[model samples]
Target: PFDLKKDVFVPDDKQEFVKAQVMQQNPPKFDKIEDMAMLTFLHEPAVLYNLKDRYGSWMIHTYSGLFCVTVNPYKWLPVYTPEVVAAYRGKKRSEAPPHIFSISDNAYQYMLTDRENQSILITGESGAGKTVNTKRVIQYFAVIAAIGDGKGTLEDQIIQANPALEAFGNAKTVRNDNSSRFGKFIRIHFGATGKLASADIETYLLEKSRVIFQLKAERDYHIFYQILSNKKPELLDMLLITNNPYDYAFISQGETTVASIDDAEELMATDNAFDVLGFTSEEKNSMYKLTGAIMHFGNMKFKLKEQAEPDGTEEADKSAYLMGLNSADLLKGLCHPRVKVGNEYVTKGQNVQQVIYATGALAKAVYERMFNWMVTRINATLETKQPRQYFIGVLDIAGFEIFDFNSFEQLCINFTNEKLQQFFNHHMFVLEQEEYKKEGIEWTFIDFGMDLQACIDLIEKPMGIMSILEEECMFPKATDMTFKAKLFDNHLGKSANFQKPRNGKPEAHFSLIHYAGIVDYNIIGWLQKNKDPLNETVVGLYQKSSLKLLSTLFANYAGADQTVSALHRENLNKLMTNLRSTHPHFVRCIIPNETKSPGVMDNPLVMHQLRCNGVLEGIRICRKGFPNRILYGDFRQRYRILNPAIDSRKGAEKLLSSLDIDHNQYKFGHTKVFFKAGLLGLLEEMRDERL
Candidate 1:
């Protein structure tokens, strides 16, 4: 019933279904293939069917309407087996791999035999499956890096880390379905012979500052829910709340219940983290005590009051009972003792109206310190006892996100993104030039580094806007205060309205007084203000102690500069380069040719945009040629205008006319064509037919 010359390409129609199935599987000598059966049968085939077929490999696929890229090892023969796919499945911390790619265990063996730097990057849009793929990459490395017997206690410790991070870092969002609220770069440094090495973490852009305020429809935070549902009953009672998800002010208002989290296993894992981190019972208790203090602080309330005495002295209405603590105890816990002008030891309470404010601020500070310390503790425990060697770092950070409501924070993040793009270009094009020079491939110099420098200047240099603002915040007296005030006033609101705490100390009220993101606060407010303050006394104290921390951290790769570069480079270069090089072999895992973008060529719009912008541009470099086989949903339907006047009949006639009958290319089992109301399909069909 099929006609080679007249059939229309109706994608949704049964004939189109048959064509796609035949193309994908190339089914041979088979009985009738049902369409319903095809749906279930089209699972991913083996990545490598035969050992001999090994070469480079790449794969692309659509996940929830977004394109995802992957890599597979090259092999010569068509061998589809479960082992291949299973090989790519992510590993638990227990099963960390010794190396990355299995095709040539050389890298893994080399790392173990002679520790060298090996890096991998996983990047994409927020919900484009980057996290899941990142988990897989980590899994692969875990298994390869397993120590003697490959069955140590490390597995449990590694698996425990995820639930811990998820509880603290991940959240559900509309864009990602399940999203990471923070960005992280993890390095598993190893000793010689594949022994377990130090594991360090570099964190970036925590949306923690978002906890201070929330959008109307948005929720408070993931931790609010976890603490409400998972904390012990005694702990809950101590916080004075019988509210189980529905009763709490912060947790109850969220879109969903915290009780929904599968935390039983997570609790057990948390216990393991405690064990691996070697926290003493007393230390653990202190941690929880701090958490409880935060909860109690959140419940305090404040109000303005008139003085009962006639001297016009207004006293803050001191009601310790409101905070559920003896006023003396609350004052003791929060206030620093000061010698008044009368030579009396007086304790000054923070001018906070509500206990909740103090609790929230303290809680936030403690949690942040805990997170950073947790990584430090892990690094200490996992440090290689042997001589130092090279390391392979894995960076999984938040991908580029452009939204309608961009802010100063977003600008900084985007600026970082621009730099990352340049790094990608350098690796893909500039490095490719270097590789070509070594291989004798004729190539031109692509100034990918220029874009990289531009981004760095925007964020790092003294004259750069961000750097200037930070410097002003650090040395407020040295700079004209009016300029600093004006800049803050312009970006935020009225400078006069930015009130400091009545205590006369700027630091206490800095967070509540200033409007900024975590990056601005940490870089300028905390780092600069605290470490290099304008006040002579504060500056002297900081110089003697705090400034040393900055120097030490900066000297090590763990410092801000190296951490930022490492996180950005791995994502832009290593992983993306590997994906681009081996695309064809893993085509099924990638977008197929037939459905690849409509109206457009078989590539993603981003890929095309990168090429048009000059693939050597650092941001667009890794994406070059990646669209060759990408599938788009409505691409062909939109490309019809390019070839008007070619009717369905004439289109087929034109296609056949252009083909050489004598050539074997036209001798496929049969050919068919279809017509749609648009010119896009015709253009795409003609183009595909030509190749």
Candidate 2:
């Protein structure tokens, strides 16, 4: 007759005879609960059922304590229209049901009232609507905070930055039609009294490899397809390319279109964004030229005459002209290149394979640098040079990924998510407990972050995975296999987070137990990816380009000196340091169904994301400890009618004791009272009766 727990263990022999534990049922009134933490049962099943109920009614936003958990509806809902935005404007979070706008508004109010920095951290898998929600957050601010007309205002430029960057940074992935291949931190600055002041955006780790190759189901970045859409025939003639996407090998290998996206319309929006962001005609033309040049890069080929020479001048001439460089010099750099050995220069020849690799490398580098420049240009436009008061930053990054063959990029991205999850745990559990202790409360500390620390240590600690991978990148004799062997030798059996592949392809695969899930990473090509080798001869040619933009792309790197992994680590560290300084609000997006079907909820899929994203773990911790707190002054002020004698923490304790409530329901701290999940509501009810 026991009420069933969410999880139970039974012996294998007893399982057949034992009746399956009856799942605990929530009361019917708890259906469509606005906040998950308010649920009485507070179990996985109850949470899922509540979400399912609300989702069925087109209510996609639900609250889980301090976090806003959103399930993607896949279909458009009018909840995001301007009228709805106005409804949420300046309203307290409690005044409305759970919403992204509510979260943004709360962050905005806190920034103004608290006079501190705020960060809204949005994290989820691709296609889970991180990008869309990020745009909404900014849009909420733009409408509420801005005063000037829409045309060419800083707010307009700030909003337009998304489309411009998306054209270059977003692509079509198997999971998402318009997937952001890069991570971004958009900091919207404000002046005194919450006026929109200025803004700056920081981009991280554009998936440069997609510039050269994409899976059969995926397409290259939106910019390539946008140009080829041929809305502007002049662009085709100017860039020396035909209308057909099949003419270019770089983008034609995979999907040429996404049914949901109209590339021609998006291209117009992208160009409008450039104009809104204050890009000159020459600057836009230069960017288009580089895009065209990268396409021609894939077209460049070589013959095996004299250890490889140019097979034709057509591709080289087009690419070089687009980049504002000489065709003959470009061919020489690729085929017969000069080398510096022993402080003396000598000309060396590259084989067909070497040139091919160099061409791809150059294409990736050009696109990456061009993307960075676009961000910089956008920042310049948004820089108002006013004395800033406070700022709200929005972080939208790639979520935990596991693929058929994960590589170095996956490792870096997953490592980043691990760090973020630890941050969440630290903020929610560690800091909550620390606050209780600081307030002299009788509390048990729960170190939710302690488990993830092991995973973090495996990746970022001294002589850990990142360090070893970076070391191997610098080791001239090292190969991918050697790197794998080194990782195995150091942490194979020693670390719980480290594991050998379950099946016996041990030579090529090693698994890491990430905070999200166990992902097996293929070590093949990892060394090359980490090193990110580029031919110096080809880069040197670009450095001497006639176009200033092309030359500036290679200005910082005369040749390759930094490994890609090291650069990523440095950027991530900077990002972490920045985030730590601000008060954070979290928005966890969930993918309801894999097929993108509307209104159909897959229970297990939602459950997996909930567990992985720590929503369930957060609930578990909330139930174990205090989930609500009220400062002594606020408590007494609100409950004075019920008990006017309450003045201090001791008085508050007396008032609670006098009330007809269980002692275990609340605890008195030095300056605040901590209440278990629903206990605070009982006091509110008593106060309302007194009123």
Candidate 3:
């Protein structure tokens, strides 16, 4: 029988399988289970199950070999105290219980000792606690690295980027009510003295669709919900519409009311953030009203030209429609653009689908431009462009989604993650290999290579997916069908994961198996989605906007430029380049349940991400490492007594030489001495006998 708490791993030779099963049924008798590595399990599921249970009743964090598995506790935990940070300061990973800070501490030490850079890659789906964990890592860096006063301002400004980012870029989704919709990369550079050289944030892929139409059970960017609450007299007392949020077309579409969030409190925080970012109430009001306009825009339904009729102003549809109509079409009627007939001008009223597309287009343009604006302002508030000695970057990006009914958005998210997965693989694989070789530990894998580079290359190559889409986008006459054919022809007989386009389907479909998993994409609106339309009239209005933040962006770059995707791809490439040069720490956030419930643990779902994010794979690798690796200098200092009369560097070298090492026992690298776990025991036994 197996004893779990006592950690006795008995085999079948010792007992019958039936006999062991009964003994393994009870909860452990241990007083405390602080760390998973110490708390052994007789079976894999038992370990995972116990980890989740401990996550609920005992610990907020747990370790699986090298990774720190963080469960989103739904409710805020009382940990992350200042005392906790102090305890973690200057400590080794093994010294402290697994917390996010321990990750930073290890990075901090590794970087300083090696004089290199470090990065933390934080990932999980919408509500998987990525942003929260990201903030914790940031806070840890700014606080721990700010002990000396020289780097004080550096911490403040970096801390200062948080509010503006979360305000404009975060939104409520089905998975997470307060989900961060944009990907952020934070790189903080440290000099020789360990003072700040510089820091910057790189943003990619804002969920622009949410601005126009939120899916069922989702919400638009949270800023919309906060201002629309209309509680503050200065903001809006009567909400410019009916009392119910349902009346506001943008928010009403989804579950606008989130039980966990207090809109008033969030509004207060965001307002403070805006003010800190140097945006006054007037500028804030303009951004606020722009959101209101998008809400009303969603109500703009239309009929065929012959059966044309407005949802007349007397009804909720009209005022809201007019409100939307009045908002964006500043120059000539953006809601209904002007098209010239043979001799005269005519306002081109939209078809049913056209109206839907236009509203979403405007919504996307405004939100994306606004995000650019907010990022610009925030960067200005925290700008430090000077050169640096080294940097530690943190990337909190979207998690992998192989959801049912996936589409254009899913493809982009999954594609981005595929590339990221390559980085993780190379980072983990390369770093581990380097350590083993450096320590003179010899080993080889029967496997050829370990990474997603093949698919990663496929997605971005000259004739690849994005390139094909971009090529089709160039011609106005190119339909999604034409694009589908191009993709099928391109991948035919070559890419097995690539699916052929269905001949006559209502919703156009095609797919490829991404590194994460298989993702099917509906190309129904792929063209328009990529088009990312910015109304010229609307851009003009924003150009003259009193809000410096808004005007600054529109005047420089407005709407969805064709090159935007290229820009995102370029930045991600550069970001990975930076990661390749640095030490990487992986932090995986797991959503506890689909219900957005905090306390309850969904065993299978948790395990799925654990394996997907490579925590499980990492566990297997870390479990087998570093029996003994002593630096030459350290080895000499410690073992000099064994060769008291030997010459200079030869003393330690002579002692090691006298050990009669062999292949299974150890190997000597250029600068370090290595030994198998048992090899050192054998040496100690021989040394005692000689004495």
Number of the top lDDT candidate? 2
Q: In candidate 1, what are the lDDT values of residues 2-83, reduced to their tens digit?
A: 4434432223242122232221332332112111111212222211111001112222221110111332221122232334
Q: What are the per-residue Cα lDDT tens digits for candidate 2 across 383-476? A: 9998789999999997667666577778888888888877888888888778878988777776553458899889888789888888888888
Tens-place lDDT digits, model 3, residues 1-691: 4354553323243221212332243346532344444433334454556566677673767776556678888887777876687778888665567789998878878788778888888767657888888888888877776774412266765775776677677777656677777788887777776766667787888877767666666777777667766656555532244445676666667677788788878888777766655666666766666555556556555455432334433333332332233332342344466555667656765555655555567667767877777676666656666656777888888767644456667777777777776776666666666777665556664232457766776678778877887777888999988988888888877876676544322343776766555666777667767766655555555677554545665677633325445666787888778678777888767787788776888766666566667665555554455434667786666565554553334555567766566654556666666664445546655555665
Note the Cα lDDT for every prediction shown.
0.38, 0.84, 0.66
Off by over 4 Å in 3: 1-50, 145-157, 196-198, 237-243, 296-356, 384-388, 434-441, 446-450, 489-494, 499-508, 544-549, 558-565, 597-599, 625-631, 634-667, 674-691
- Candidate 1 structure lDDT: 0.38
Quote model 1's TM-score: 0.53
Q: Which is the better candidate, 2 or 3, if ranked by lDDT? A: 2
Worst 10 residues of 2 by lDDT: 10-19
Worst 10 residues of 3 by lDDT: 14-23
Global lDDT of model 3 = 0.66
